[PDB]
mmCIF file of C-alpha atoms and ligand atoms in Angstrom:
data_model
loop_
_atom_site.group_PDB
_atom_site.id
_atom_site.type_symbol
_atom_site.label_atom_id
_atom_site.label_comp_id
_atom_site.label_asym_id
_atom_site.label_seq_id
_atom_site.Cartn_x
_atom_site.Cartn_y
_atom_site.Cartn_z
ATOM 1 C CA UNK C 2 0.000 0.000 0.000
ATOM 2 C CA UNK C 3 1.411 0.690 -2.169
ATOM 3 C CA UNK C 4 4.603 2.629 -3.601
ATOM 4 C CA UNK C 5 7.411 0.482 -5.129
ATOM 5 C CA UNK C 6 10.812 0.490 -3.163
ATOM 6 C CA UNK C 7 13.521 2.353 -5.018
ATOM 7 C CA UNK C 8 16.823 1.074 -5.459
ATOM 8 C CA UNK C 9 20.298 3.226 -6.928
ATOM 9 C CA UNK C 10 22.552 1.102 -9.024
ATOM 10 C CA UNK C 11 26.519 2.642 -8.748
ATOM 11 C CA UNK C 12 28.680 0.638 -10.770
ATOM 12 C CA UNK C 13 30.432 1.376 -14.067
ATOM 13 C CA UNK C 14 29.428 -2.127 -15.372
ATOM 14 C CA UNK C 15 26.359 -1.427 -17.547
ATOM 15 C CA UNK C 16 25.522 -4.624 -18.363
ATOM 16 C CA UNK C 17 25.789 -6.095 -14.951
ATOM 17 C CA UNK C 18 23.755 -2.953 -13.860
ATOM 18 C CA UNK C 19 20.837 -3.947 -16.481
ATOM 19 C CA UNK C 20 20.623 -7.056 -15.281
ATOM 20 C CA UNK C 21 20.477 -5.962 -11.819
ATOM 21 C CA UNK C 22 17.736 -3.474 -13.271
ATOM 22 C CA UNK C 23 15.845 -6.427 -14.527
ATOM 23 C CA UNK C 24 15.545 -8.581 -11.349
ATOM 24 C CA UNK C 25 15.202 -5.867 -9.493
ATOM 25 C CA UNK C 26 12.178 -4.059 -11.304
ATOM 26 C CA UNK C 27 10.807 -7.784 -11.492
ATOM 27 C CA UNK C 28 10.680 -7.838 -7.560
ATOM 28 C CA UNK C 29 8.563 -5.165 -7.438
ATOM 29 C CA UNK C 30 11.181 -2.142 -6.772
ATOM 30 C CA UNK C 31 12.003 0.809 -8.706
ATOM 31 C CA UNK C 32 15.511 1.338 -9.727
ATOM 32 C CA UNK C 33 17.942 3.717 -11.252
ATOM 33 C CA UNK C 34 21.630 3.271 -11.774
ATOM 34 C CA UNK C 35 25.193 6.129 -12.256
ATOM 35 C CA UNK C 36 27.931 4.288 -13.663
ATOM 36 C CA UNK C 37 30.395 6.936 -12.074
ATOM 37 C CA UNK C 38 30.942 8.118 -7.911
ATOM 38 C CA UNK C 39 30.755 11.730 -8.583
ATOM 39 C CA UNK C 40 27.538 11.777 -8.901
ATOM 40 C CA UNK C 41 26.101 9.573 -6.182
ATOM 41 C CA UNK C 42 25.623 12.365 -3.383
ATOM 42 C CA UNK C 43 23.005 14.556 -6.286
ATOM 43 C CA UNK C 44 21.293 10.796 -7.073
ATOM 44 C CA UNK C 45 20.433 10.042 -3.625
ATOM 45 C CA UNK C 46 19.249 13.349 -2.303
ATOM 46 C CA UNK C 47 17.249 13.462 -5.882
ATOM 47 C CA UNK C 48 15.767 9.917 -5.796
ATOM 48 C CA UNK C 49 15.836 9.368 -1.856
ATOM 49 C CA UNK C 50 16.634 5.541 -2.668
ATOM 50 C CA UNK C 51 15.550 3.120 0.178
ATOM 51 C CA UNK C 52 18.902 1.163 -0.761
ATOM 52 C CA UNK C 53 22.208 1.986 -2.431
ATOM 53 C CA UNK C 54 23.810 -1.187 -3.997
ATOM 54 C CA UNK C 55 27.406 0.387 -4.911
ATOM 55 C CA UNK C 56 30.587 -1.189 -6.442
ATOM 56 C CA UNK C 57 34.116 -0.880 -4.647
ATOM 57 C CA UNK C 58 36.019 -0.208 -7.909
ATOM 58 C CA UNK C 59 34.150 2.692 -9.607
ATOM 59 C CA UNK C 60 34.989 5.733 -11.975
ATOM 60 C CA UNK C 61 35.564 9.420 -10.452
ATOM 61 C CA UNK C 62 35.387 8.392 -6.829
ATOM 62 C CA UNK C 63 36.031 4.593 -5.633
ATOM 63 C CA UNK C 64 33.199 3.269 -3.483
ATOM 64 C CA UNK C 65 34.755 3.919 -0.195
ATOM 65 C CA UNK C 66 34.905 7.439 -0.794
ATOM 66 C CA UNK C 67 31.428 7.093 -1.769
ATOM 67 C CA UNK C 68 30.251 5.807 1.261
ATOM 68 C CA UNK C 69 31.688 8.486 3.899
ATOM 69 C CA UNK C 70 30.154 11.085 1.225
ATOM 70 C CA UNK C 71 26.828 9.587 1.510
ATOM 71 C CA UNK C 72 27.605 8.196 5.358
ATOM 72 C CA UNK C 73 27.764 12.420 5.999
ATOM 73 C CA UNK C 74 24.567 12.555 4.645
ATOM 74 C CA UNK C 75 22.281 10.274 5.781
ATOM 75 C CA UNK C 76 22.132 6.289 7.144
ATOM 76 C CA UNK C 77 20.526 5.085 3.838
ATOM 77 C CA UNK C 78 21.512 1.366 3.505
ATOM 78 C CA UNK C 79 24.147 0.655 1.520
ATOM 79 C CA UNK C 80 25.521 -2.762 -0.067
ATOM 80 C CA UNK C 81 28.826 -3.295 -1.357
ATOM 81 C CA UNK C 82 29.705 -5.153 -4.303
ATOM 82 C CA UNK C 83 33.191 -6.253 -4.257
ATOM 83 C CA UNK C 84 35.471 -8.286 -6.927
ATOM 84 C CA UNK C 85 38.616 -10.768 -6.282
ATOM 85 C CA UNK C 86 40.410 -8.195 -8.593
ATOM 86 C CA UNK C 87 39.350 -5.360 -6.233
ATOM 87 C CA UNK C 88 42.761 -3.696 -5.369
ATOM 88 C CA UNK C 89 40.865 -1.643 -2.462
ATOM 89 C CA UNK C 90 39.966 -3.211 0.925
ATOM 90 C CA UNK C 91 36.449 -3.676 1.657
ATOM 91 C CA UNK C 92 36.860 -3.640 4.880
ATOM 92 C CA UNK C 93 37.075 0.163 5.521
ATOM 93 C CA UNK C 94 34.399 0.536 3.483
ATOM 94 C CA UNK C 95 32.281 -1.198 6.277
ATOM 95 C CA UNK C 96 34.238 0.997 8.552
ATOM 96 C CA UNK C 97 32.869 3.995 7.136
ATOM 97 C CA UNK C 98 29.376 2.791 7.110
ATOM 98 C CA UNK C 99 28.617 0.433 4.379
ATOM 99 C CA UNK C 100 25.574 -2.384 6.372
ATOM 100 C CA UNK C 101 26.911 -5.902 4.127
ATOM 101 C CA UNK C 102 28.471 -6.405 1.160
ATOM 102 C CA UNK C 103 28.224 -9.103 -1.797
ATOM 103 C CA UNK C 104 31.621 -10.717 -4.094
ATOM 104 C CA UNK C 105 30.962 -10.854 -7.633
ATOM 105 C CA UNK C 106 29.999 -13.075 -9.663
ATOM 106 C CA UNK C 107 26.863 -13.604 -7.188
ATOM 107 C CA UNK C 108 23.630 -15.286 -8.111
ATOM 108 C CA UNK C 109 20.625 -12.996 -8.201
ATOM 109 C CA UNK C 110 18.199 -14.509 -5.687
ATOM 110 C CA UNK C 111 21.173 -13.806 -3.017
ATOM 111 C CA UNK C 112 21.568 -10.319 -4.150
ATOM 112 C CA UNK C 113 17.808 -9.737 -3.494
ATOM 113 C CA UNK C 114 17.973 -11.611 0.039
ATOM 114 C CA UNK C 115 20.740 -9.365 0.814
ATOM 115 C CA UNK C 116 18.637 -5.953 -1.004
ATOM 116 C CA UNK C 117 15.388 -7.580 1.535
ATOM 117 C CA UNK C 118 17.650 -7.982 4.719
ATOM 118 C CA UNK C 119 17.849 -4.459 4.503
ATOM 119 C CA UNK C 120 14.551 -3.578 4.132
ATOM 120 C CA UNK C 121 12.827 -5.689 7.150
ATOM 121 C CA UNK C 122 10.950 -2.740 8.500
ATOM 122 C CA UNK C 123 7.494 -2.129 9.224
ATOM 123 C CA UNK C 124 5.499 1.011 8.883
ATOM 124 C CA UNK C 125 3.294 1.757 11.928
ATOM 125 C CA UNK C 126 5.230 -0.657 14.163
ATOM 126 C CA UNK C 127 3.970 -1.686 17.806
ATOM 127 C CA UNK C 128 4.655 0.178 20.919
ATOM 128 C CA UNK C 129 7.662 -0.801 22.529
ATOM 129 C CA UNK C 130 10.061 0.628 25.163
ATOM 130 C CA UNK C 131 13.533 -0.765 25.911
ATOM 131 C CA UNK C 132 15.904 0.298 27.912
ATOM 132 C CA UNK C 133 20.000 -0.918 28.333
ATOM 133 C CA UNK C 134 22.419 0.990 30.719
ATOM 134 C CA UNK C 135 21.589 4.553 30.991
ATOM 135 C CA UNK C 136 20.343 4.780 27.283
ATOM 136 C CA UNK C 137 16.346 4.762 26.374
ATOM 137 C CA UNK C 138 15.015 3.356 22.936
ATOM 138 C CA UNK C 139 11.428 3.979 21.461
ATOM 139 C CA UNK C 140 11.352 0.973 19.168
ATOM 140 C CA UNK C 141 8.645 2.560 16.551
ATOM 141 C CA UNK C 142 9.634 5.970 17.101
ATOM 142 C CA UNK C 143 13.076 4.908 15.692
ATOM 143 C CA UNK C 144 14.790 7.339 18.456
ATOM 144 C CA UNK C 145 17.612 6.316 21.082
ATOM 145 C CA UNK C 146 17.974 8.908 23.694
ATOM 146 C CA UNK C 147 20.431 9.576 27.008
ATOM 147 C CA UNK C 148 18.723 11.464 29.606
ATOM 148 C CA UNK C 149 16.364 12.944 26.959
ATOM 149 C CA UNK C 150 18.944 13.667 24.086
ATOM 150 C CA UNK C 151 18.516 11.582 21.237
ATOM 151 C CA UNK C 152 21.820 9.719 19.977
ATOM 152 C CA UNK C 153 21.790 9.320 15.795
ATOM 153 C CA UNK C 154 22.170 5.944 14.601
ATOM 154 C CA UNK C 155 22.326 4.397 11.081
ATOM 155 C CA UNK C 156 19.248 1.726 10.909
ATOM 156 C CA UNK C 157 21.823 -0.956 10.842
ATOM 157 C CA UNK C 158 23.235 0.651 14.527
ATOM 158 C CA UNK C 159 20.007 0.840 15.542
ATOM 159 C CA UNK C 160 18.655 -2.392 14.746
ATOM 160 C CA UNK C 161 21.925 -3.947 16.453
ATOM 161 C CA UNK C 162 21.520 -2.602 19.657
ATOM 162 C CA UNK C 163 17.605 -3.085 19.860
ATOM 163 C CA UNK C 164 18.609 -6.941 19.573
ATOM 164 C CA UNK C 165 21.029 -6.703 22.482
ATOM 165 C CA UNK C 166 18.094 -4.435 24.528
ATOM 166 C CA UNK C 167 15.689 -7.065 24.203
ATOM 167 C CA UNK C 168 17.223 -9.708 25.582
ATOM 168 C CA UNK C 169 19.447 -8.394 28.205
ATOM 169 C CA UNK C 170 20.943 -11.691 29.667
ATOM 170 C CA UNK C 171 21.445 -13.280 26.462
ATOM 171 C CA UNK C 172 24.963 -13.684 25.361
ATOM 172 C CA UNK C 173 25.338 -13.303 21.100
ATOM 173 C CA UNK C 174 28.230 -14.900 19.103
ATOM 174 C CA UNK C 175 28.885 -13.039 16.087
ATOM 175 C CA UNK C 176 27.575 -15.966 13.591
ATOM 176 C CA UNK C 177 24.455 -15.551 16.043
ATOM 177 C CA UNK C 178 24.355 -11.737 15.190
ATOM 178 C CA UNK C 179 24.806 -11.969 11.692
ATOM 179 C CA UNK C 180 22.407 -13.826 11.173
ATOM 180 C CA UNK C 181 19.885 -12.383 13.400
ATOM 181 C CA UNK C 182 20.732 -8.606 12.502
ATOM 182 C CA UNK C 183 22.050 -9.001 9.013
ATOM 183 C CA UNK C 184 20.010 -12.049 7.717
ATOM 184 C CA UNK C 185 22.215 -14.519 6.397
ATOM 185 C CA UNK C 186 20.954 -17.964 6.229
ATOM 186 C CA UNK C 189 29.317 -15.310 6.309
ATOM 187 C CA UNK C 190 32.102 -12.263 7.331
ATOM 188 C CA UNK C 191 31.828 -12.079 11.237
ATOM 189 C CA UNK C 192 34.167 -9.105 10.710
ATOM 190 C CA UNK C 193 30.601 -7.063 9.190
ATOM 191 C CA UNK C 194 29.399 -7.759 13.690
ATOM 192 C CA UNK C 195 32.937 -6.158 14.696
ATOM 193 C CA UNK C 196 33.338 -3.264 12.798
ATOM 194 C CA UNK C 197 29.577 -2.049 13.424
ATOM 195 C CA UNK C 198 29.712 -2.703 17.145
ATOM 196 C CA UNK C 199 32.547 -0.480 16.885
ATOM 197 C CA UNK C 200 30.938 2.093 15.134
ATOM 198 C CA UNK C 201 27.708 1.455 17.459
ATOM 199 C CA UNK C 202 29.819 1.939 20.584
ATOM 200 C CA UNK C 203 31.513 5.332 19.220
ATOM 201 C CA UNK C 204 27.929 6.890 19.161
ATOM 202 C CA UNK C 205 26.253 5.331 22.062
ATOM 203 C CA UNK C 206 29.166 4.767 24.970
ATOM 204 C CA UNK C 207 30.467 7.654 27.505
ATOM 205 C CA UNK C 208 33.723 6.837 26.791
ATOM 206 C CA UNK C 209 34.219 4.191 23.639
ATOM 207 C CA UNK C 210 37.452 2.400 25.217
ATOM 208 C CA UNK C 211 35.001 1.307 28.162
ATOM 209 C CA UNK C 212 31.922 0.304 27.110
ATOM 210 C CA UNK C 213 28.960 0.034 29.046
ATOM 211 C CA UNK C 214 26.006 -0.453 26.958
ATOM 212 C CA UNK C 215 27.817 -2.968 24.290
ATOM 213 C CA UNK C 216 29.726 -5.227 26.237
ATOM 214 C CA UNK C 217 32.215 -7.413 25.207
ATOM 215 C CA UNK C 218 32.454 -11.682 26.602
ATOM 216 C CA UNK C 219 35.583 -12.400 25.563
ATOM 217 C CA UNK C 220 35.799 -15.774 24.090
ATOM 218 C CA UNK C 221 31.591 -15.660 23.064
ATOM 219 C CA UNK C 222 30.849 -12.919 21.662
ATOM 220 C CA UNK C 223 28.856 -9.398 22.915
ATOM 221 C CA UNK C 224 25.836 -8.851 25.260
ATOM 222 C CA UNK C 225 23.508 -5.794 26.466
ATOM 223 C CA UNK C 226 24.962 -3.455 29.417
ATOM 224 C CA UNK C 227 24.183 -4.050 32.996
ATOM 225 C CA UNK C 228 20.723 -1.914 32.863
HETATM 226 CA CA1 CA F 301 33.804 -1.514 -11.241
#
């Protein structure tokens, strides 16, 4: 009810970037695609894509660079498609705030699992109040707040911690997390570098966490509320 999804294509491949027009329209989501990283930050604010699928290796501006442009501009989701010829690391592209990312060649069907992981989230959603630690979270109000000051989050940082603040004495490994955050039915480096970047925005003091903690040897668990 009833507006199609809309997806932004960045990659320089233009075949590759029909197809993924194709399968994508054919799930029921609009698309459009740039073939070069200069013009990614005018596409988004113009379309206001629900998703950004965006190759490492691209024309003008890799796709790291891409993704602390965009990362300064909003949390829109973003998925990285990376090659084995990539000569970049992928890796601080998560840092900087890219949610997953996919190796080429993939099949479709898992590049549209990945594109739905994303995109889990229900309009009108029920009331629900959590708290962990000090910090407050009004699940469908999307809003995290310390003694009434909110704290931004990407949806990806928010959705991790809301799975921590619901079940406060549960324990998570990170193939645990990744699956129950990011979706997979593989990378548990994807549950590190965001509970970093989780902890720089929602801790006192980063180096000593108390709303993310760390069980060494298992894996991460919600602060002593
Ligand atoms: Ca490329």
């Amino acid at each position: 009810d009833t507006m199609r999804q809309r997806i932004l294509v960045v990659d320089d491949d233009a075949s590759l970037a029909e197809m993924l027009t194709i399968v994508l329209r054919g799930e029921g989501f609009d698309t459009a695609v740039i073939g070069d990283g200069t013009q990614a930050l005018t596409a988004v604010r113009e379309l206001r894509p629900d998703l950004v699928l965006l190759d490492l290796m691209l024309p003008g501006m890799n796709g790291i660079d891409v993704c602390r442009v965009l990362r300064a501009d909003s949390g829109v989701p973003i998925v990285m498609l990376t090659a084995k010829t990539d000569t970049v690391d992928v890796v601080l592209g998560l840092e900087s705030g890219a949610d997953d990312y996919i190796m080429k060649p993939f099949k479709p069907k898992e590049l549209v699992a990945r594109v739905r992981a994303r995109l889990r989230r229900n309009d009108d959603e029920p009331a629900e109040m959590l708290s962990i630690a000090d910090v407050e979270i009004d699940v469908p109000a999307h809003k995290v707040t310390r003694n009434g000051e909110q704290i931004s989050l990407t949806p990806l940082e928010f959705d991790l911690l809301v799975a921590l603040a619901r079940k406060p004495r549960q324990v998570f490994t990170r193939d645990v997390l990744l699956e129950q955050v990011w979706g997979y039915r593989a990378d548990t480096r994807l549950v590190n570098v965001h509970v970093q970047r989780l902890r720089a925005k929602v801790e006192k003091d980063p180096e000593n966490p108390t709303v993310v903690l760390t069980v060494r040897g298992v894996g991460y668990k919600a602060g002593p509320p």
